[PDB]
């Protein structure tokens, strides 16, 4: 689904797959 | 390969398109990542954090007085302390929050809304608050006995000095629209009406006009679709240092 | 509520009516790792000399007090061994240990949002001119908020709890503790000309009481945790 | 921590949880945001499996929308004949994230932002009002050259700085798809500090908030073709799509209207909403419901 | 030697290295460049892992930027009617690396350069000032024919040398993407000698620096379409992107402004910087700091 | 394959693009590579080689006198011999070097800068030089005791007759910008201030006005991003034999 | 003779005509061990910030120049990060790295005994009064010798080579290096009011030459090795 | 410093105050390999007849001496057996062994950058005309620098140390040695009409002394290493 | 595949280009090769003849 | 990442992968 044919990794598709999230940084920044 | 026919959506500039485009420096290595604290990879990380509701919302309340509601020693029971409209996508006390302003970048939203009220009175100021989220379909309850039939919580101040009324996700649809009408079935959310339960009792040497700060966040069941431009900001004219970033 | 002891260097802070601390974004302060570093010179690492809880000048809390703010490292740019290392080094990397003591009676009503803003690019009301040195780098005494309701930058105080924040709701909290690590896109930056943090004490509920109105000080004590100093030059 | 959740989390069935000694809804706001969940207290929930959308509200997907950053309408005529300050068939634009308040507010939710800027240039030709006759829209080849911040920028249309031997330039026609290029994440720091609580230079007379590290560069956009006898208002609209977003330290959204590109100076509207003394439009009282169902 | 390093090299931790009999910072410039590294002396460094960029500053990536080599604006009208020397709807350009000082200075950092020239021709049409009316920009098909150096070049637009039976020609429209072609590395020597300390012919009257081996060829660019009743200034901009770069014997960069395409003759500006007697702009003294922080 | 839609970045001419283009001779074999000495595959191979700094930089110094600094027998201690601004991307004594001119083809640079000073006096000319790179944030040190607090090295001439002051990489950011302002935090680098340490002592039959040639190179920790056109060269007018390469 | 490189912190000294160094009494400088320590507070250990070769003001050498002396830490009590840590701490433990550069021509005749005196309790000629602050704590500029022949304390210069000593006999030595560890009966002492060392440059052979008499500076560069700072107080 | 002996053919050069040599770009000179060759005729390979250190005419060094340059092979195009093979062959491939002797006293101050420029396409000041034969091929005597500060080609002397270079800093270096291999894009080229190298003696520090100003010669001795000659024709 | 951006050398007519082009008869079988003498596959076969 | 569909090796993409470098040719051309 990626047609990144250029030699730079920054030129790739918008990586909308970073599903990892940590809300406890901002919701529960204690102990 | 060689036989290629152009699609009807070819040559267009979609805003939300994700196709890979050309580099300008052909061998640019960026500076490597350092561990900056608080990496934000989803909006739900910002969504579930509390943020002050503009509960007072009144013209005499200027600035600082808007983010708190002044709850006073009432001489009689069963008065409405305040009622908050839960239009998180429309202008209201929930608009100037993390969840309201960020959800106004979307048209469709879902999930439970936590609403934490912190009693910012004295330690000796005692009182029970009953906070009742009413599901939509009827009027806002101005009386407590019409309000406690909905999602109500009874809160004694005590040592913890804060409560969380979790507004549940009861709707016919999976999501609620923005749709610019607060009367709609898929847009009206309910009413958080807070009342006296057993009255606010303060000593004579403590302030009678106590204050309450409410917050709305959400839980991890929150969700957002149909991204749109937020109406909180607006450009009618090109700002200062624009046309001076060009000269 | 929660008794908290913070001991660094020769300094120690005990509080008996505090909450749990606000270790910012789930990370302790840390020294620069080898894979993360940019400056090839060896950092100073003064540790216990600059881990001291530098207690700033307390600001008076009244009914009409809009708010106060101290920019980090600008608040400690001239104070103590951390201040001397700030003038003597061009690069630093220090987290901070915020402790805000607001000692008030049990009959006192008030709530201070202690909010640590990363890069508070402050605004100026009714003028398009950028704020100068006399509007930004107020130093140890720390600037008062012209419009804390908009956080003095066009943003909102109402959404400021996404930042590392505590409350000194005077019902059951007399002291606040926010533990900030290093917060910059660069690993190190100039302490005299960039404020990586600031601490904003904003009375979202002002001081209201019906007893004898005594002077309530807001005392800010910042302990620079994991402080590192690179590029040893003359005292700038 | 260690949550790689891809949908909204489902709630479990909640019974009557009247247990003495523990209370979930009683929390401390003086620590952070509260952890009282839906099946814990205040509602007797049911087990509903939540399959709701999360990929759309990803911070990547939140900020990977190509929004306008430079709409400049410059005339295309004999500017060399008699013009003083106006854009002589070319404009050097300091690439800032702050020119248009939509994408400015979107990136200003975060303190730090590591992204590559997918710059897409959509250029339109219109006939200027002095000519008052169509006579066809010409196919104009335009050069957009990314000059580093502070480096030597051209002064003319044929300024001999348009050779682009080392500077990266894109040549694109108006009768073509819009110019899609990817400016790298080129900051000398590991993110673009969208806000800067500091000054650019070591002198005290520096500008507040303008870190040249987070200044992306200078898009110098010119007509490669020489002048026509007919003048044409070339409206070049640079839309920047921030891609490969890594965001840090989320912030309050900007509520007051923006005044300046350079700083975060504030002045609200003359009445609420989004006013300096009242961000929200005012109700009648605390007990008054706006848009109440009647 | 045998370094296939892909990033900047990391420094190791340095302690107090006061050792008698050895001193790293004491070197000999009368041998070459010094080998005194950062953890060896003069700084007590820390171990910082260096992940910095190297692929962008590759000599390939340094010289693979498509910079202008031939900007020629020739008129397109009845040139056969009355013209004497001007380009009769066609121009033969001797393909030289030296026409524009940016890419000239970039390739003149090296003595020898083996590269294939990705010639991209971006041609723009403008209406000439004699007509003083737009009337649409015509779609013009242009032929760029690569003639070998010294071979028979055309003399007219319809000169019957444009058949290109053996010569390589590219036909390209102005309402099209620019003409991307790759001229091979066609030198009779194994690199283009960007500088030549010699003469072309065995006679003493030859030209200095013009080795015909490093002369790439002759791009003869014409309008394939016959003349319009309206004249059009066709500005053809040949940008050459040097690709598959192999570079040899690096040189001082050219500091003085270039005077001639043929030679490396020098004449600086009338005052410093880049003047003949002073390449750098002069300070007040040795002890005076320009742009000192105050 | 057959269904192809054109991207917004299609049909454009990027300068830094790397797509393969058409050959003109369909079977051209180039002449084979010979081993020409000094194969340059990266700019760092040219970067770490020493190159004369224009330390004198003064209007009385014409040509040859600019690349050396005349250090004389001083009658008193603790004078500034010279101070060098380390703006490798801005016009200064480091501009006319390999590292300066080549780094001005870039906007962002990083890495330690080695600076080797060779004492070009007599053998009997003795003296100690203290060379102090000062990190940015303050003024250039005109006095030695303010200078030795930074990165200082003490150099006795001796038999080796050259020293290397390695300017370390201490910066808040990973890279330093060009940005056309030498006062900026991300652009100012520091000041290499060289002072007398124990004075320059020459015999009466040796020249009192001794000379010093300084050089700046870098190490293998150097790095360059954001390639730009160098302002060292400039074309205001089409040069000679242009329009004679066309005729 | 012997090329010597001394690199500490951001500072580095190269010398091409030096001898072997004078690591004092056969011991390197070291930080305070746990069994040796007295102060229970944690030492600062600034390391590379205060390991810098602090170059002092060079003194002119003439024919009639009796001698010079700089008391350690009094010479560096106000200079740099070491000076800032001296005012900010009541206790310190630092060794020193003496490097004395006397650059002279090969036709110059002279011999400087660089002698490091532990606790130079100096004397005063023709008076029984103890020397005051203005006769002892001269600081960075450093006192000139009234009577260096008796080492200005009633002792003898002739026996001063029992002390850690080097020579700048200008025949084949242009620079001297004496590496002093911590030298006190106490593990730590007050830097503002006790000089654990001093460095005395005494021209036992004065400057004599028959060429053009040029200014010969005696430049003293002291790098505080293994510097430790205890008792973080205000700047005294 | 370093005693260096270079012995080729009947010639030998000993130097006692030289540095390490400047073997150019890390490669020794070599004869043409079979895979590298272009001319199918057999090379001459005169070896010891043309490996001789051909000593050129020494140029006088003064205070105002701008610089000198000898183009290779043009400097040796007429000198000795190498010169005879240059006239008798149309193709050659020879590296060079540069040895520049500048014998000066220990009280003499001066620094000659000996810089070997590959294809010095020289410039002419204030004229766009290319330099002719009388401005380029000066032969054995070798051209003087009109503007050595710009390397007489618009480049910079200040960046000329990227080229194979040595210094005759007269403090501790009296002779320079640069060992050049064959430097051309072609394997072989015409020696009479292409200068593959040149050697530029540029006094970056001019001759300055306060003794009796004696004549200091700059003597250039070039030994053509691995010299190969192809295409035996008449003496051109 | 579907996302395709046009190169700068797209739509041009190079003389020496080697891309496969369209047939005009969709099933044209040519007449088969006979062994004509002197098959010339390189110019060097003609070059080395006097 | 290479779309070299032409029959000539010189027509390929700009090979920005020659990471091998030898600075000792130019930095240390001795011994």
UniProtKB/Swiss-Prot annotation, chains A, J:
Transmembrane segments: none annotated. It is found in: Virion. Myristoylation is required during RNA encapsidation and formation of the mature virus particle. Interacts with capsid protein VP1 and capsid protein VP3. Lies on the inner surface of the capsid shell. After binding to the host receptor, the capsid undergoes conformational changes. Capsid protein VP4 is released, Capsid protein VP1 N-terminus is externalized, and together, they shape a pore in the host membrane through which the viral genome is translocated into the host cell cytoplasm. This is Capsid protein VP4. It comes from Human enterovirus D68.
């Amino acid at each position: 689904n990626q047609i990144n044919f250029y030699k730079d990794s920054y030129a790739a598709s918008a990586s909308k797959q970073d599903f990892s999230q940590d809300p406890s940084k901002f919701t529960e920044p204690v102990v | 390969g060689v036989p290629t026919y152009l699609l009807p959506g070819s040559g267009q500039f979609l805003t939300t398109d994700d196709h890979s485009s050309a580099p300008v420096l052909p061998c640019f290595n960026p500076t490597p990542e350092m561990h900056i604290p608080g990496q934000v990879r989803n909006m739900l990380e910002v969504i579930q954090v509390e943020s002050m509701m503009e509960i007072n919302n009144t013209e005499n309340a200027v600035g600082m007085q808007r983010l708190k509601v002044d709850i006073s020693v009432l001489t009689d029971v069963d008065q409405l302390l305040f009622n908050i409209p839960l239009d998180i996508q429309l202008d209201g006390p929930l608009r100037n929050t993390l969840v309201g302003n960020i959800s106004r970048y979307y048209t469709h939203w879902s999930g439970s809304l936590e609403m934490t009220f912190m009693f910012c009175g004295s330690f000796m100021a005692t009182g029970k608050l009953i906070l009742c989220y009413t599901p939509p379909g009827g009027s806002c309850p101005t009386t407590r006995e019409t309000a406690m039939l909905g999602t109500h919580i009874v809160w004694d101040f005590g040592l913890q000095s804060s409560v969380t009324l979790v507004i549940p996700w009861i709707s016919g649809s999976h999501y609620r629209m923005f749709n610019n009408d607060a009367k709609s079935t898929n847009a009206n959310v309910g009413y958080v009406t807070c009342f006296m339960q057993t009255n606010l009792i303060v000593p004579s040497e403590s302030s009678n006009t106590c204050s309450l700060i409410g917050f709305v966040a959400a839980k991890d069941d929150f969700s957002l679709r149909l991204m749109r431009d937020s109406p909180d900001i607006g450009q009618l004219e090109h700002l200062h240092e624009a046309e001076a970033a060009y000269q | 509520d929660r008794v908290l002891q913070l001991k660094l260097g020769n300094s120690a802070i005990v509080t008996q009516e505090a909450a749990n601390y606000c270790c910012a974004y789930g990370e302790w302060p840390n020294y620069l790792p080898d894979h993360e570093a940019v400056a090839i010179d060896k950092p100073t690492q003064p540790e216990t000399a600059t881990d001291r809880f530098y207690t700033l000048k307390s600001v008076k809390w009244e009914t009409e007090s809009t708010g106060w703010w101290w920019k980090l490292p600008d608040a400690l740019n001239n104070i103590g061994m951390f201040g001397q290392n700030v003038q003597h080094h061009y690069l630093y990397r220090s987290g901070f240990l915020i402790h805000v003591q607001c000692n008030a009676t049990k009959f006192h009503q008030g709530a201070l949002l202690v909010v640590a803003i990363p890069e508070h690019q402050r605004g100026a009301h009714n003028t398009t001119t950028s704020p100068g040195f006399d509007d930004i780098m107020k130093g140890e005494e720390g600037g008062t908020f012209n419009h804390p309701y908009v956080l003095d930058d066009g943003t909102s105080l109402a959404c400021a709890t996404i930042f590392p924040h505590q409350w000194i709701n005077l019902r059951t909290n007399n002291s606040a503790t926010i533990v900030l690590p290093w917060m910059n896109a660069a690993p190190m930056d100039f302490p005299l000309r960039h404020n990586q943090w600031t601490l904003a004490i904003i009375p979202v509920v002002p001081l209201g009481t019906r007893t004898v109105s005594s002077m309530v000080p807001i005392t800010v004590s910042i302990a620079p945790m994991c402080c590192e100093f690179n590029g040893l030059r003359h005292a700038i | 921590i260690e949550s790689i959740i891809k949908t909204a989390t489902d709630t479990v069935k909640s019974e009557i949880n009247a247990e003495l000694g523990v209370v979930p809804s009683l929390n401390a706001v003086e620590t952070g945001a509260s952890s009282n969940t839906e099946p814990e207290e205040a509602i007797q929930t049911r087990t509903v499996i939540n399959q709701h959308g999360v990929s759309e509200t990803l911070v990547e997907n939140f900020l990977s929308r190509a929004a306008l950053v430079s709409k400049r309408s410059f005339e295309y005529k004999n500017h060399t004949s008699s013009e003083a300050r106006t854009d002589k068939n070319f404009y050097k634009w300091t690439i800032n994230t702050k020119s248009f308040v939509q994408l400015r507010r979107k990136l200003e939710l975060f303190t730090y932002l590591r992204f590559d800027a997918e710059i897409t240039i959509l250029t339109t030709v219109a006939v200027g009002s002095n000519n008052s006759t169509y006579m066809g829209l010409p196919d104009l080849t335009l050069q957009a050259m990314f000059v580093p911040t502070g480096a030597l920028t051209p002064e003319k249309q044929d300024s001999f700085h348009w050779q682009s031997g080392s500077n990266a330039s894109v040549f694109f026609k108006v009768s073509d798809p819009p110019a899609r290029m990817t400016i790298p994440f080129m900051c000398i720091n590991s993110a673009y500090s969208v806000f800067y609580d500091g000054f650019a230079g070591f002198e005290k007379n520096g500008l507040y908030g303008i870190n040249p590290a987070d200044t992306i560069g200078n898009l110098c956009v010119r007509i490669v073709n020489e002048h026509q006898p007919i003048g044409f208002t070339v409206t070049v609209r640079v839309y920047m799509k921030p891609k490969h977003i890594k965001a840090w330290a989320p912030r309050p959204p900007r509520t007051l209207p923006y005044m300046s590109i350079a700083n975060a100076n504030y002045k609200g509207k003359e009445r609420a909403p989004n006013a300096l003394n009242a961000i929200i439009g005012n109700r009648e009282s605390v007990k008054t419901m706006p848009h109440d169902i009647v």
